[PDB]
Design a protein around this ligand. Structure first.
Ligand SMILES: NC(=O)C1=CN([C@@H]2O[C@H](COP(=O)(O)OP(=O)(O)OC[C@H]3O[C@@H](n4cnc5c(N)ncnc54)[C@H](O)[C@@H]3O)[C@@H](O)[C@H]2O)C=CC1
Ligand SMILES: NC(=O)C1=CN([C@@H]2O[C@H](COP(=O)(O)OP(=O)(O)OC[C@H]3O[C@@H](n4cnc5c(N)ncnc54)[C@H](O)[C@@H]3O)[C@@H](O)[C@H]2O)C=CC1
Ligand SMILES: CC(C)N(O)C(=O)C(=O)O
Ligand SMILES: CC(C)N(O)C(=O)C(=O)O
Ligand SMILES: [Mg+2]
Ligand SMILES: [Mg+2]
Ligand SMILES: [Mg+2]
Ligand SMILES: [Mg+2]
Ligand SMILES: [Mg+2]
Ligand SMILES: [Mg+2]
Lengths: 331, 331
């Protein structure tokens, strides 16, 4: 399918418009600053006190030069109400702090399709509902913008009572320079499923488990953990950069013939058919709502699995030895 | 285990030594230029004509301002004869072109232990035998050096009849700035096995099979290949950059809580204990000489598996669509 770039998109429609960016975290910080840098009027909706403490994201937004309002006041003010809060808390915050401020002619915007896809938020009929979803972590998205490039993005329109929903959504992507990498138009559901799949199976789940297992195999065989860290973790960035630049082709050219042979002779013995079938099963659970139900129930129960996994992550030798090695860099 | 940095190593021994770099490819080009930039005297040993045509590596090294000799004359001139030719061709080139020029107390150096470890090259008793092995592809090694940093390295000594083998090896890594990231001392056999394992199971085989299988799963489920590319390949660099900078801890902080939950809930279902067991098996074939014999036999046969693999790689959709996408970026 077709990829839209700067040459395809008009950003003019944003001249008269205020974007209320709700949540100043990984995506909200990046997107609000890219938007502001591009001359768009932005206000931040944030919560001053969370769990009984000062919310550092409220203080940061202020310090970074934004108008910062309570979410309800931001919503009143925004022509686009762009929800960059954690997915698990959006439905409550939406019901309670956003919805009463919606009015015909506002657009409700997201950067992930989850809450609309799975019907955890069902907006009123007379608001536009759009998605601008970056295929990037927010910190790296901001740096791409600052380097004169951008990250790829997916754009979706669920409701269009204004007639202008698509044009607004695309214009935002252009203002954020995501068009420099490329935009794909899709549905809320499509983005939801691919994105859950990729993070679980490839980018976060897959990557981390691959590196951790390799690291463990070396250490359990008697290799020093520092050596396992350099081989399995530090060098991953250097190899991935070659793929990002020129595909497998470029990476395969630069590595030794020994390594290239090993890649093809042995890689598929490690990550074989069984992995691909497990990926299929995970994708099914994404598509059919089972994974969504699990995550909603997890959050309802006070995220005990997530809390325990975070504590266990930090105890792993890959993390303790990595932190010691990186702290000793002359960088 | 001790990691050596800049303050731990003295490179002054290289002051009156000439390094003959044999092969000006990914490693020879990077290493030669880092050494030359640090003020070390380097000569290139290369072959003017390969397969009946002008060898571009010969020309490039002339163009980059080196003295470029046939391998035999380069070996004569070098105090350090540093073999950065493809592993599979070193034994014949060593026997024919290098070995007769070896004199007592020269140092024979490698950047991978394979040929010494598996006894494909058996050096005379009266030369030092050293290894300076960067944990990095050569293009990214050169970039790190130009950026004021360095790549991690492994340093081994197999023979030390001069007494100065270790000092020379370490000095080389400091002059190439690898000490800025850090150097580990190890044996030739240790480097060989960890290196082979890492490229097979994690960095090249594992990484490429992980991304390819994810990409296929999406495309086979009806998602556009451009979408599968941005999700499974382009974003991988952005994620791995976080891990490289601050470990899994940093990455987990930046991704969404939805993604962090997915990572821990689902990742190990994709890449699980069965994968770890395959990794153990692959490591055993590396340690026991099976892999090494297969790669020798493959080369002796005219690399038909590697040729067939190259061809099929370049026909995969991940490669053809990725190339089309990357051509359309606007940096
Ligand atoms: N880079 C990423 O993290 C990516 C995120 N997404 C999507 O972007 C959206 C935002 O995600 P993130 O930036 O990771 O959010 P985040 O986890 O950084 O949260 C944003 C801000 O929400 C506030 N917040 C946190 N918990 C709260 C609560 N209980 N009540 C009120 N406010 C609270 C905090 O000030 C926080 O800084 C999500 O829909 C996510 O799926 C899309 C692409 C990538
Ligand atoms: N980045 C990498 O590619 C890494 C390589 N290594 C090791 O470095 C050493 C060098 O590997 P690479 O740089 O990949 O070598 P390469 O494959 O780039 O070969 C170096 C040069 O050797 C010459 N050459 C090629 N075939 C030849 C033949 N049949 N006869 C004569 N000369 C020939 C060509 O001019 C070529 O540029 C190996 O021991 C390898 O395991 C170590 C770390 C990483
Ligand atoms: C990997 C990560 C940045 N990502 O793309 C996400 O969609 C997420 O954080 O949810
Ligand atoms: C991954 C690759 C660059 N590597 O570290 C090697 O050992 C190789 O190219 O053989
Ligand atoms: Mg994503
Ligand atoms: Mg996501
Ligand atoms: Mg090659
Ligand atoms: Mg290696
Ligand atoms: Mg190798
Ligand atoms: Mg979080």
């Amino acid at each position: 399918m077709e990829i839209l770039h700067d040459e395809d998109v008009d950003d003019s429609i944003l001249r008269d418009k205020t974007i209320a960016v709700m949540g100043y975290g990984a995506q909200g910080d990046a997107q609000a600053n890219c938007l502001k840098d591009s001359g768009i009027n932005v206000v931040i909706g944030e919560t001053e006190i969370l769990g009984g403490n000062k919310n550092p994201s409220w203080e940061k937004a202020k310090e970074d030069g934004f108008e910062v309002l309570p979410i309800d006041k931001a919503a009143e003010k925004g022509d686009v109400v762009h929800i960059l809060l954690p997915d698990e808390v959006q439905p409550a915050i939406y019901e309670n702090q956003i919805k009463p401020q919606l009015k015909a002619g506002k657009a409700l915007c997201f950067s992930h399709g989850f809450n609309i896809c799975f019907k955890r938020i069902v907006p009123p009929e007379d608001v536009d509902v759009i998605m601008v979803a970056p295929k990037a972590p927010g910190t790296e998205e901001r740096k791409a913008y600052l380097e004169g490039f951008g990250v790829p993005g997916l754009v979706a329109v669920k409701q269009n009572p204004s007639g202008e929903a698509r044009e607004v959504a695309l214009a935002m992507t252009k203002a954020m320079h995501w068009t420099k990498a490329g935009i794909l138009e899709c549905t809320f559901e499509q983005e939801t499923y691919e994105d859950l799949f990729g993070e679980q199976c490839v980018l976060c789940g897959g990557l981390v488990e691959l590196m951790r297992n390799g690291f463990e195999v070396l250490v359990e065989a008697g290799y020093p953990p520092e050596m396992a860290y350099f081989e399995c973790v530090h060098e991953m960035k250097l190899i991935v950069d070659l793929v990002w630049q020129g595909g497998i082709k470029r990476m395969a050219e630069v590595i030794s013939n020994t390594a290239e042979y090993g890649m093809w002779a042995v890689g598929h013995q490690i990550i074989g058919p069984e992995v691909k079938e497990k990926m299929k099963e995970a994708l099914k659970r994404v598509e059919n709502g089972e994974f969504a139900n699990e995550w909603v129930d997890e959050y309802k129960r006070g995220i005990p699995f997530l809390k325990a996994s975070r504590e266990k992550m930090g105890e792993h030798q890959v993390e303790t030895v990595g932190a010691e090695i990186r702290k000793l860099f002359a960088q």
